Design a protein around this ligand. Structure first.
Ligand SMILES: CN(C)C(=N)NC(=N)N
Length: 437
């Protein structure tokens, strides 16, 4: 039963970004109006009428921020008793009427209640969610550093058991976070211990079994854990429930790499390629989490289309080569992103087709570069180089939400333009690497 424990760890690594994708799914949050709600319940009692009358939806050019944070209430309550147009008592023009800030609670039209429902990160504090994911990725960086330090400090078994216990306790207590600062601290510690524990588990899986087929099986177990996480999240929406029920399964018991000019360029290229691969992966996953109204089934398809990509990679490691399939995969990802920005209102089936093609390309690129990294670097500083490249991977993970949630608010097209430019540049730059194969 050696493989079952590793598969369970892989499943426990699912909520890394999928955690904030499912938990951070922001529903249509309209700020609560005291007078309007009472009158609507008294006479209207219609969700469509309440949505149309509580907030001003007249947002030119698709701007919903004017209606996602404003009540535009003139304290009409039920005095007018029109029930067809309560806002007509003050003025006919809904947008021209003054709208004070909605500092009160927000109403989230969802049978479940995500993190935004229980923490009021509705519209004015979206950078709080961005900072949440950024703190998770900074936790990965500092946790790689701490895991290296602890491995150099005590050992490979006491550190492993300690970080596994820390991960289990951090998840369980993060399911019981009263305020936002405690949730942030627990997420930081969770990132630390999760990065360390996954690194240790992958190293043990690839070392104690003696094969790359075992690593492929580990990635497949990660995908299976992702599918199980999506299936479990669909059954129970609440974020506390999901966090508790995904943390419970875990609880069962030289630095001079820039010296050689020939090697410095290769290190720079590999760093940039992986960096942009992690950025594209997290960006597409968060985009799917923040644009789909059927996120459960869409995300299930996205997770299920990962394993044909893994099979293609396992077939093409020895067939295509080591540098040629990288450029093709990145160019395919860039073309897919361009089609996404060109086919947003064309067809949703076309949208999911392009999405799964892009995800397959990203998976191919990530697996190939993970192989190449360990393949080319010399044994003296292989770990060092892995840590150095993971540094920029964590930098990209930090940057990704702070750019996605800062550019989407002003225009929908900017994140896709940025992703396509990054992918095309990666495809055009990764072909200058020497013969890794
Ligand atoms: C596919 N693997 C192994 C990842 N670690 N991916 C990731 N987004 N962290």
């Amino acid at each position: 039963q050696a493989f079952l424990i590793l598969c369970l760890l892989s499943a426990a690594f699912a909520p890394i970004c999928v955690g904030i994708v499912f938990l951070g799914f922001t529903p249509d949050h309209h700020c609560q109006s005291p007078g309007v709600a009472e009158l609507s319940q008294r006479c209207g009692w219609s969700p469509a009428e309440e949505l149309n009358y509580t907030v001003p939806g007249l947002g030119p050019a698709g701007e919903a921020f004017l209606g996602q944070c404003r009540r535009y209430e003139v304290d009409w309550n039920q005095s007018a008793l029109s029930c067809v147009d309560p806002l007509a008592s003050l003025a006919t023009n809904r947008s021209h009427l003054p709208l004070g800030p909605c500092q009160d609670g927000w109403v989230y039209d969802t049978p479940g209640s995500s993190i935004v429902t229980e923490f009021n990160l509705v519209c004015a504090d979206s950078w709080k969610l961005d900072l949440f994911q950024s703190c998770l990725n900074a936790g990965f960086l500092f946790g790689s550093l701490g895991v290296g330090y602890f491995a150099d400090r005590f050992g490979r078994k006491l550190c492993l058991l300690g970080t596994v216990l820390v991960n289990a306790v951090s998840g369980v207590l993060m399911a019981f976070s009263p305020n936002y600062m405690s949730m942030l601290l627990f997420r930081l510690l969770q990132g630390l211990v999760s990065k360390g524990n996954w690194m240790a588990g992958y190293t043990l899986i690839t070392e104690f079994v003696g094969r790359r087929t075992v690593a492929i099986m580990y990635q497949m177990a990660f995908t299976v854990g992702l599918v199980a996480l999506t299936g479990l999240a669909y059954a129970l929406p609440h974020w506390r429930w999901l966090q508790l029920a995904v943390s419970l399964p875990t609880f069962l018991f030289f630095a001079d790499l820039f010296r050689t000019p020939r090697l410095r360029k290769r290190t720079f290229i590999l760093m940039y390629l992986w960096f942009t691969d992690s950025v594209l992966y997290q960006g597409l996953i968060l985009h799917m989490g923040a644009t789909s109204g059927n996120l459960y089934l869409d995300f299930l398809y996205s997770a299920l289309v990962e394993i044909p990509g893994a099979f293609i990679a396992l077939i093409t490691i020895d067939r295509v080569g080591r540098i040629y399939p990288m450029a093709m995969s990145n160019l395919l990802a860039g073309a897919a992103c361009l089609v996404m920005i060109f086919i947003s209102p064309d067809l949703h089936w076309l949208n999911i087709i392009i999405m799964c093609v892009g995800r397959m390309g990203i998976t191919i690129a990530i697996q190939m570069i993970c192989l190449v990294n360990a393949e080319l670097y010399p044994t003296f500083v292989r770990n060092l180089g892995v840590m150095v490249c993971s540094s920029l991977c964590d930098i990209g993970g930090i940057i990704t939400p702070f750019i996605v949630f800062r550019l989407r608010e002003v225009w929908q097209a900017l994140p896709l333009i940025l992703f396509a430019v990054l992918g095309l540049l990666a495809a055009g730059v990764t072909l200058l690497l020497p013969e890794t194969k």
